[PDB]
Amino acid sequence: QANMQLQQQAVLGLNWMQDSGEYKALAYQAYNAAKVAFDHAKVAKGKKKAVVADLDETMLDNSPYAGWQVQNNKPFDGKDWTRWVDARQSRAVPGAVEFNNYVNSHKGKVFYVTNRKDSSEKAGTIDDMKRLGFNGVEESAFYLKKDKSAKAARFAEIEKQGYEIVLYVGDNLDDFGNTVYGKLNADRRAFVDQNQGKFGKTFIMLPNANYGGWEGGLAEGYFKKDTQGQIKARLDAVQAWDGK
Amino acid sequence: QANMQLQQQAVLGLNWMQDSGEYKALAYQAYNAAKVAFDHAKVAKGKKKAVVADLDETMLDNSPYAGWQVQNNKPFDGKDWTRWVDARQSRAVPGAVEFNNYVNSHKGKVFYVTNRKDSSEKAGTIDDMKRLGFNGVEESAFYLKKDKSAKAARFAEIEKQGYEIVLYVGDNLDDFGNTVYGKLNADRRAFVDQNQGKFGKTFIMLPNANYGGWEGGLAEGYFKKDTQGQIKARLDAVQAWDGK
Numbered sequence A, B: 001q002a003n004m005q006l007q008q009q010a011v012l013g014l015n016w017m018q019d020s021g022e023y024k025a026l027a028y029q030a031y032n033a034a035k036v037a038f039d040h041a042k043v044a045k046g047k048k049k050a051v052v053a054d055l056d057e058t059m060l061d062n063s064p065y066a067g068w069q070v071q072n073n074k075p076f077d078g079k080d081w082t083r084w085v086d087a088r089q090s091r092a093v094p095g096a097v098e099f100n101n102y103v104n105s106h107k108g109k110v111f112y113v114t115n116r117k118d119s120s121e122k123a124g125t126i127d128d129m130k131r132l133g134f135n136g137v138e139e140s141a142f143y144l145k146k147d148k149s150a151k152a153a154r155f156a157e158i159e160k161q162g163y164e165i166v167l168y169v170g171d172n173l174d175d176f177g178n179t180v181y182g183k184l185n186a187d188r189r190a191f192v193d194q195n196q197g198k199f200g201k202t203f204i205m206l207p208n209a210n211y212g213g214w215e216g217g218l219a220e221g222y223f224k225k226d227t228q229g230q231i232k233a234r235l236d237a238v239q240a241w242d243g244k
């Protein structure tokens, strides 16, 4: 089964995210930097300070779903995902709760801009965030996915309400705007070089070695490929020393 | 072959580190935070400002060696590693060169505290660092491994010369001292919680989902286990949703 080959390729990165103190230190580092950024942020007169935050693998830890995929040789499946969301077993990314609550009690507002589905995944999402200790998880704070996965228009909606976004937190570059949405990794890397100065300042990164826009970035039409085509794209992407 | 199963488990994390703009953004974020830390660092009168930096997967990118392991189903092998080092094809972790040069030209000194071998890996190391553009790669800047892998005694040696280490940069928690050297991941995670405030400040983390002290941290005597025992430890470490 090519599906076993596909999920086994995630095992080491899953181990790292789930078990290592290194992963946790990177989460703390991101949220420590995010606090400094928020403290220093200067906002135009008339505006209120907003922080925009992605959820999955930024504030919520869905690693148990990945653990289930590995154990059962399952590729991603939207219906399996909703059952996970409704299981209400999401964990918190280290640092995230304390950061969220800090912002919200110090003249800011965190907005959750997320591609969990507004229709079917809102309830489990809000339940888990309350349980995990996030302050300000009222409906109005959430900009969940409707039709589009691209996030900029939701950022814009927030700006329409007299907020100035002072920072953006995410594990995916598409959490920072639409510049490289649906683009291959060369373009995505180019965006990062162009915006080098913003990282750890206006753009706050969380680590995610398991999935994301970088995965689709491995090859043209990657997500439309079958399991074998996806494995091939992963393997063809490998940069290797010749052994000499 | 269990050895194929072992290296295939690294593929996705290797793809991430090698190809994603996200990895690069995390490297920039770490080095942007490191610059802020260095700018603000206050040192006791009489002392000179030191920065201590690990090399492999902190300032030097050895991902092509990992790419060769995957392509050839090879576990880690010290002799293969030296040939890689002597190949002189090391790449630079994004941000690292600019950070190193900044410190060294602004009343600081970067010291390279590294477990590349002093005897046999020094020459290739220095060659690659000069080629990559690191300033101050004279012999005296390097504290390469002799007998011990633990790093604290080398940090102490630096402190003996009238330096105060203002920050430490690494991809491994053992790059920050000896508190959790050779310990399992629970202890390692506990260290991170105890030192939560230092991350992105005094302790600067780089991402490494491919290998490290966290790998040995998966199980008691992990590095002494055969390939099958190591795969088992990885798999047994997986935290999984029950699917309901």
Ligand SMILES: [Mg+2]
Residues within 6 Å of the ligand: A054, A055, A056, A057, A058, A170, A171, A172
């Ligand atoms: Mg996310």
Ligand SMILES: [Mg+2]
Residues within 6 Å of the ligand: B054, B055, B056, B057, B058, B170, B171, B172
């Ligand atoms: Mg290292």
